[PDB]
Symmetry: C3
Subunit: 191 residues, 3 copies
C-alpha cells in the first residue's frame, strides 16, 4: 500500500512536468499565430509600403558593433510578394558608408501566374519628418538575376541600392530623417 | 518526506492552473484581436452593426456596460486611427434621453507623419433599413480642443454628438432604425 | 492519499482542458487563414493544390472556397467546386458554382443579387483561359437574400472537360495545382 501510493505520487510528478512542456509549445504555437496576424496587419496590397523603424540609434550602434527584414507586402492581392532588407551600417559597395536598402522577392502563393523576371521599377524614400524633402533612390531590376526569377526558396537574395543614403547626412539639422528615435522608409513599386 | 512531495505538487498544480488560465486569456484576446482586424476599415467610412439592441439598451439602463467601443478604423492604411464610442442610454446632456455617439482619435503607428490637429469633417448616420430618412448629423471638430491634438496616450477624449438621436423614436413604428433587434451606425470621416 | 486523488483529478482536468485549448488554436488558425484568403473588390482567386489526389477522392463531395465579398459592406460569396462534377457534368466535367452567403450587412443591400459572374480556369502559360459567364436571373432562389447560412449554388455544370484538364497542351494543372478566378461585377 505504501510503495504504490508512492508510485502514484511519482507519476503525478511526471504528469505535471509533461503538462509544463505541452503548455510551453502551445504558447509558442500561439506566438507565431500572433506573428501571422501581425504580418497580415502590416501588409499593403497596392505596391506602396511604409516601414516605421523605432529605436534607431540603438540598432545603428549594434549594426556598427546586422540586417533587418520588413514585414511582407504585395504589388496586388494576387501580385508579387516582397519585403525589404535594411543594413543600418551598409552592405556591398556601401559596407560602412551608407544605409543599404534592398528589395527581396519572396515566393508568393500565386507565382505560377505572374511574369518572370520581376521587372517592376522600385522607388525608395527616406522620409523627412519636419520638412518635406525626402531622400529618394530608384531602380529597375537587373534582368533575370537569381534575385528576380520565381523563388524555389521562400526568399530570393536581395537586390537594390547599396548606397541609398550615407550615414553622415543622417542627422543633419537641415532634415528630420530621424525623429523621436524613429525613421520612416517608403517603398513604391509600380503596378 | 511524502508531506514535502504532496505539498510540492499542490504548489505546482496551482501554478499550472494559473498559467493555463493566462494561455486561455491570451488566446481569447488573440481571438478578439482577429475580429477587430476583420471589422477594421481603411477609407475613413465605418459601418457599425450593433445586435441585440433591446437587451443592450436595458443593459445600459442598469449601471451596467454603459458605453460601447467600436473596432478601430482608419482614414487610410497609414492615416489616422479612429474608433467610436456609443452610449446606448446616453451621456452628458443626453443621459437617459438620447443615444450619444462620439468619435475617438486614437494613437496611430504613423501619427508622426500626419497633420495635427486632426481636421476632417465627421458624419454620423443612424441608418433606416426600410427605405426611409436616416437620422444624420455631422460636425467639423474644433481646433482648440484636445480631442484633436496629437494623441499622447492611447486615446484622446471623445468628441461628438451627445444628443445625436432621441431614444423614444429609436424603435418607432414609422422608422426602421432597429429591425430584427439590430441597428446600423455609419460614420464617414471626410478624407481631405 | 485523498489529496493524492484530488491532485490526480486536477491534473487530468488540466490535460483535457489543454487539449480543448489545442482545438481552439486550430479553429482560430483557420479563421486567420480565411481572413488572408478574402478579397473585397469582387474578384477572387482560388488555388487548389494536390489535384490528382482530390480527383481520386472525388470519385471515392465538393470543395467550398474561402469567402470573398463584393465590397467591405457588400455581398458575402464563395465558390463550390465538384472536381468530379454535378448533374449534367457528373463524372465528366468540373462543376463550378457561385454561392451567395448570408452577409453581415444583407439587410442594407438590394435584393435580388444582380451582378454578373465570370468563371475562369487559368492556363498558367501566356494565353488561353477557359472563360464562362452568366448574369443572374431575378427569380431564381440562388440570388435573393439568404435566410440560412448559404443559398443554393448557381453556375456552370460542364464548365470544363475532366479529360482536357491534364492534357499536356495547356497548364490548367501544373505542379499538381490549378487556379480558378471568379470575377463579380460591381
Amino acid at each position: 500500500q505504501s510503495q504504490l501510493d508512492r508510485e502514484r505520487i511519482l507519476s503525478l510528478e511526471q504528469r505535471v512536468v509533461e503538462l509544463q512542456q505541452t503548455l510551453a509549445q502551445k504558447d509558442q504555437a500561439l506566438g507565431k499565430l500572433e506573428q501571422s496576424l501581425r504580418l497580415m496587419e502590416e501588409a499593403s496590397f497596392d505596391g506602396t509600403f511604409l516601414w516605421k523603424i523605432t529605436n534607431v540609434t540603438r540598432r545603428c550602434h549594434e549594426s556598427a558593433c546586422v540586417s533587418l527584414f520588413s514585414p511582407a507586402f504585395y504589388t496586388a492581392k494576387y501580385g508579387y510578394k516582397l519585403c525589404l532588407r535594411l543594413y543600418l551600417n551598409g552592405d556591398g559597395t556601401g559596407k560602412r558608408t551608407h544605409l543599404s536598402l534592398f528589395i527581396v522577392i519572396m515566393r508568393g502563393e500565386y507565382d505560377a501566374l505572374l511574369p518572370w523576371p520581376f521587372r517592376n521599377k522600385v522607388t525608395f524614400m527616406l522620409l523627412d519628418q519636419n520638412n518635406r524633402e525626402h531622400a529618394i533612390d530608384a531602380f529597375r531590376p537587373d534582368l533575370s538575376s537569381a534575385s528576380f526569377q520565381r523563388p524555389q526558396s521562400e526568399t530570393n537574395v536581395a537586390s537594390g541600392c547599396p548606397l541609398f543614403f550615407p550615414l553622415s547626412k543622417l542627422q543633419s539639422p537641415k532634415h528630420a530623417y530621424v525623429k523621436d528615435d524613429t525613421m520612416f522608409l517608403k517603398c513604391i513599386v509600380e503596378t
